[PDB]
Write an enzyme that holds these catalytic residues in place. Structure first.
Site, PDB file in Angstrom:
ATOM      1  N   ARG A   9      31.199  79.703 -13.399  1.00 28.11           N
ATOM      2  CA  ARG A   9      31.974  78.954 -14.375  1.00 28.11           C
ATOM      3  C   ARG A   9      31.024  78.204 -15.312  1.00 28.11           C
ATOM      4  O   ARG A   9      30.228  77.392 -14.845  1.00 28.11           O
ATOM      5  CB  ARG A   9      32.919  78.057 -13.576  1.00 28.11           C
ATOM      6  CG  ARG A   9      33.991  77.384 -14.415  1.00 28.11           C
ATOM      7  CD  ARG A   9      35.039  78.358 -14.899  1.00 28.11           C
ATOM      8  NE  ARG A   9      35.865  78.900 -13.825  1.00 28.11           N
ATOM      9  CZ  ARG A   9      36.778  79.879 -13.966  1.00 28.11           C
ATOM     10  NH1 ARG A   9      36.940  80.558 -15.097  1.00 28.11           N
ATOM     11  NH2 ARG A   9      37.501  80.214 -12.921  1.00 28.11           N
ATOM     12  N   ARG A  10      31.098  78.494 -16.626  1.00 28.67           N
ATOM     13  CA  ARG A  10      30.177  77.958 -17.638  1.00 28.67           C
ATOM     14  C   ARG A  10      30.055  76.436 -17.565  1.00 28.67           C
ATOM     15  O   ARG A  10      28.943  75.905 -17.522  1.00 28.67           O
ATOM     16  CB  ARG A  10      30.537  78.234 -19.106  1.00 28.67           C
ATOM     17  CG  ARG A  10      29.842  79.441 -19.721  1.00 28.67           C
ATOM     18  CD  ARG A  10      30.491  80.734 -19.317  1.00 28.67           C
ATOM     19  NE  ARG A  10      29.891  81.885 -20.009  1.00 28.67           N
ATOM     20  CZ  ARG A  10      30.332  82.492 -21.102  1.00 28.67           C
ATOM     21  NH1 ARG A  10      31.296  81.981 -21.834  1.00 28.67           N
ATOM     22  NH2 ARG A  10      29.754  83.594 -21.492  1.00 28.67           N
ATOM     23  N   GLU A  39      25.728  92.749 -23.845  1.00 32.62           N
ATOM     24  CA  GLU A  39      25.367  93.078 -25.220  1.00 32.62           C
ATOM     25  C   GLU A  39      26.533  93.695 -26.009  1.00 32.62           C
ATOM     26  O   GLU A  39      27.666  93.211 -25.911  1.00 32.62           O
ATOM     27  CB  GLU A  39      24.054  93.846 -25.116  1.00 32.62           C
ATOM     28  CG  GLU A  39      22.945  92.881 -24.691  1.00 32.62           C
ATOM     29  CD  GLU A  39      21.528  93.433 -24.586  1.00 32.62           C
ATOM     30  OE1 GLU A  39      21.359  94.680 -24.515  1.00 32.62           O
ATOM     31  OE2 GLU A  39      20.587  92.570 -24.605  1.00 32.62           O
ATOM     32  N   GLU A  82      36.463  89.063 -12.427  1.00 31.55           N
ATOM     33  CA  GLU A  82      35.251  89.557 -11.813  1.00 31.55           C
ATOM     34  C   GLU A  82      35.424  89.626 -10.303  1.00 31.55           C
ATOM     35  O   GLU A  82      34.939  90.560  -9.685  1.00 31.55           O
ATOM     36  CB  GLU A  82      34.033  88.736 -12.192  1.00 31.55           C
ATOM     37  CG  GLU A  82      33.703  88.840 -13.686  1.00 31.55           C
ATOM     38  CD  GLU A  82      32.750  87.792 -14.212  1.00 31.55           C
ATOM     39  OE1 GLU A  82      32.583  86.686 -13.624  1.00 31.55           O
ATOM     40  OE2 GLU A  82      32.141  88.171 -15.234  1.00 31.55           O
TER      41      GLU A  82
HETATM   42  C1  LIG Z   1      32.341  87.653 -24.214  1.00 28.76           C
HETATM   43  N1  LIG Z   1      32.226  86.204 -24.034  1.00 28.76           N
HETATM   44  C2  LIG Z   1      31.018  85.572 -24.180  1.00 28.76           C
HETATM   45  O1  LIG Z   1      30.843  84.419 -23.805  1.00 28.76           O
HETATM   46  N2  LIG Z   1      30.014  86.296 -24.719  1.00 28.76           N
HETATM   47  C3  LIG Z   1      28.701  85.707 -24.958  1.00 28.76           C
HETATM   48  C4  LIG Z   1      27.882  86.484 -25.974  1.00 28.76           C
HETATM   49  O2  LIG Z   1      27.088  87.363 -25.214  1.00 28.76           O
HETATM   50  C5  LIG Z   1      26.632  86.649 -24.072  1.00 28.76           C
HETATM   51  C6  LIG Z   1      27.850  85.737 -23.704  1.00 28.76           C
HETATM   52  F1  LIG Z   1      28.569  86.227 -22.634  1.00 28.76           F
HETATM   53  F2  LIG Z   1      27.538  84.459 -23.345  1.00 28.76           F
HETATM   54  C7  LIG Z   1      33.241  85.520 -23.221  1.00 28.76           C
HETATM   55  C8  LIG Z   1      34.620  85.931 -23.608  1.00 28.76           C
HETATM   56  O3  LIG Z   1      35.455  84.807 -23.344  1.00 28.76           O
HETATM   57  C9  LIG Z   1      36.809  84.995 -23.331  1.00 28.76           C
HETATM   58  C10 LIG Z   1      37.587  84.135 -22.563  1.00 28.76           C
HETATM   59  C11 LIG Z   1      38.965  84.293 -22.555  1.00 28.76           C
HETATM   60  C12 LIG Z   1      39.559  85.294 -23.301  1.00 28.76           C
HETATM   61  C13 LIG Z   1      38.776  86.134 -24.083  1.00 28.76           C
HETATM   62  C14 LIG Z   1      37.398  85.996 -24.095  1.00 28.76           C
HETATM   63  C15 LIG Z   1      33.000  85.611 -21.717  1.00 28.76           C
HETATM   64  C16 LIG Z   1      32.048  86.465 -21.180  1.00 28.76           C
HETATM   65  C17 LIG Z   1      31.840  86.491 -19.825  1.00 28.76           C
HETATM   66  N3  LIG Z   1      32.562  85.718 -18.988  1.00 28.76           N
HETATM   67  C18 LIG Z   1      32.333  85.828 -17.502  1.00 28.76           C
HETATM   68  O4  LIG Z   1      33.195  84.929 -16.864  1.00 28.76           O
HETATM   69  C19 LIG Z   1      32.416  83.832 -16.326  1.00 28.76           C
HETATM   70  C20 LIG Z   1      32.441  82.682 -17.293  1.00 28.76           C
HETATM   71  O5  LIG Z   1      33.807  82.240 -17.337  1.00 28.76           O
HETATM   72  P1  LIG Z   1      34.304  80.889 -18.019  1.00 28.76           P
HETATM   73  O6  LIG Z   1      33.412  79.735 -17.809  1.00 28.76           O
HETATM   74  O7  LIG Z   1      35.760  80.672 -17.707  1.00 28.76           O
HETATM   75  O8  LIG Z   1      34.253  81.390 -19.519  1.00 28.76           O
HETATM   76  P2  LIG Z   1      34.443  80.634 -20.904  1.00 28.76           P
HETATM   77  O9  LIG Z   1      33.156  79.955 -21.170  1.00 28.76           O
HETATM   78  O10 LIG Z   1      35.771  79.873 -20.902  1.00 28.76           O
HETATM   79  O11 LIG Z   1      34.496  81.699 -22.047  1.00 28.76           O
HETATM   80  C21 LIG Z   1      35.188  81.481 -23.281  1.00 28.76           C
HETATM   81  C22 LIG Z   1      34.095  81.170 -24.254  1.00 28.76           C
HETATM   82  O12 LIG Z   1      33.288  82.351 -24.497  1.00 28.76           O
HETATM   83  C23 LIG Z   1      32.936  82.405 -25.880  1.00 28.76           C
HETATM   84  N4  LIG Z   1      33.541  83.604 -26.484  1.00 28.76           N
HETATM   85  C24 LIG Z   1      34.871  83.919 -26.539  1.00 28.76           C
HETATM   86  N5  LIG Z   1      35.129  85.058 -27.139  1.00 28.76           N
HETATM   87  C25 LIG Z   1      33.876  85.538 -27.485  1.00 28.76           C
HETATM   88  C26 LIG Z   1      33.456  86.721 -28.119  1.00 28.76           C
HETATM   89  N6  LIG Z   1      34.299  87.663 -28.547  1.00 28.76           N
HETATM   90  N7  LIG Z   1      32.124  86.897 -28.318  1.00 28.76           N
HETATM   91  C27 LIG Z   1      31.279  85.948 -27.907  1.00 28.76           C
HETATM   92  N8  LIG Z   1      31.562  84.799 -27.284  1.00 28.76           N
HETATM   93  C28 LIG Z   1      32.885  84.655 -27.090  1.00 28.76           C
HETATM   94  C29 LIG Z   1      33.349  81.045 -26.477  1.00 28.76           C
HETATM   95  O13 LIG Z   1      32.327  80.085 -26.178  1.00 28.76           O
HETATM   96  C30 LIG Z   1      34.581  80.735 -25.627  1.00 28.76           C
HETATM   97  O14 LIG Z   1      34.892  79.350 -25.530  1.00 28.76           O
HETATM   98  C31 LIG Z   1      31.034  84.417 -16.035  1.00 28.76           C
HETATM   99  O15 LIG Z   1      30.970  84.929 -14.707  1.00 28.76           O
HETATM  100  C32 LIG Z   1      30.883  85.498 -17.111  1.00 28.76           C
HETATM  101  O16 LIG Z   1      30.279  86.695 -16.645  1.00 28.76           O
HETATM  102  C33 LIG Z   1      33.487  84.869 -19.477  1.00 28.76           C
HETATM  103  C34 LIG Z   1      33.705  84.783 -20.833  1.00 28.76           C
END
Ligand code: A1IWN
Ligand code: A1IWN
Lengths: 140, 140
Positions: A9-10, A39, A82
């Site tokens: 969790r981020r 990527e 996941e």
């Molecule tokens: C593709 N996304 C990315 O963050 N990509 C980043 C660019 O490349 C490297 C990277 F991964 F850091 C995100 C996608 O989010 C969502 C979330 C909900 C619905 C749709 C998309 C990602 C990816 C992976 N994990 C997995 O899960 C866990 C983390 O879960 P949570 O703490 O809960 O996560 P969150 O932080 O709430 O994510 C949402 C945030 O993620 C970012 N962000 C959302 N959009 C995109 C998008 N289009 N491209 C890039 N970033 C995106 C923004 O910061 C959003 O606030 C880990 O185990 C990870 O493996 C969750 C979310």
């Protein structure tokens, strides 16, 4: 092609997940964490394939890490997603416990309740090297 | 004898502080952090000797990291004592900013206000290796 997937969790687990990545790579493991190895392309596919490709699923249970999985009826939460993939695929699940309280299983979605039956590793701030060693022993 | 002393808040910054230590050791720097290097004796003495002994002082500004410094008029808080030691000794101070909100100088004790006059490094979750490379540029 990586041996280890790191689910975390981020907002509470980012720094620990990164430290886990660095240590495991030091010790010869290929590791997937999103910030390094996710990527180009549609991430829903890449993320799920990345879980499927790693023998080992290391799950960071920082405080409250599973709170967003609760009431995730439509499977929209990514840690939810996941864990289900790891469970379906019968991965070597290694929870890492960093100030987590074990919830009653039934607050979780049915499709991830089994995550709590795997043996976890207490993250020790005072004895990190030994924690890392124990994690490597668990890895397949 | 350690080249780098890492000062940090445990409740918000323990992971980052350990992450930073590993990266700097990989890059050939000797690092003091308490949970690895503070050993036998009276800790007040040994900690202060350790700050005094290290050319570089890495301060981890996790959110609210200086809260327990404010109104600490007797210098009881350990992050306060470490900073004051590093200031007095003219150490190469290197703040690492991770969600930290910069305070008005007036809310800090006079003895440690000067820490805000040093150039800090933004910890980037997405570009950690680049962050580490910049930290090593700053170090002596
Ligand atoms: C593709 N996304 C990315 O963050 N990509 C980043 C660019 O490349 C490297 C990277 F991964 F850091 C995100 C996608 O989010 C969502 C979330 C909900 C619905 C749709 C998309 C990602 C990816 C992976 N994990 C997995 O899960 C866990 C983390 O879960 P949570 O703490 O809960 O996560 P969150 O932080 O709430 O994510 C949402 C945030 O993620 C970012 N962000 C959302 N959009 C995109 C998008 N289009 N491209 C890039 N970033 C995106 C923004 O910061 C959003 O606030 C880990 O185990 C990870 O493996 C969750 C979310
Ligand atoms: C000597 N202490 C230790 O924790 N020793 C551990 C054994 O070797 C490794 C080790 F360091 F972890 C502690 C001392 O606490 C205080 C605090 C106030 C008054 C007296 C003692 C220590 C040490 C260093 N730093 C430095 O500051 C920063 C952290 O400050 P804070 O986030 O605000 O930290 P805190 O959480 O308020 O302190 C927690 C205390 O730390 C432990 N603990 C307190 N007593 C002792 C003691 N007698 N011997 C061993 N441990 C002691 C207990 O867990 C207490 O909860 C870092 O930069 C550190 O370098 C602060 C406190």
């Amino acid at each position: 092609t990586p041996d280890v997937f790191i689910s975390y969790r981020r907002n509470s687990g980012s720094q620990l997940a990164s430290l886990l990545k660095v240590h495991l790579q030091l010790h010869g493991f290929s590791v997937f964490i999103d910030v390094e190895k996710l990527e180009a392309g549609k991430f829903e596919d890449k993320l799920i394939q990345s879980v499927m490709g790693a023998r080992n699923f290391v799950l960071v249970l920082s405080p409250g890490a599973l709170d967003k999985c609760m009431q995730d009826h439509d499977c929209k939460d990514w840690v939810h997603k996941e864990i289900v993939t790891a469970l379906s695929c019968g991965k070597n699940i290694v929870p890492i416990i960093d100030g987590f309280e074990w919830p009653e299983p039934q607050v979780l979605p049915e499709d991830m309740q089994a995550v709590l039956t795997f043996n976890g590793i207490k993250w020790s701030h005072e004895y990190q090297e030994a924690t890392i060693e124990k994690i490597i022993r668990f890895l397949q």
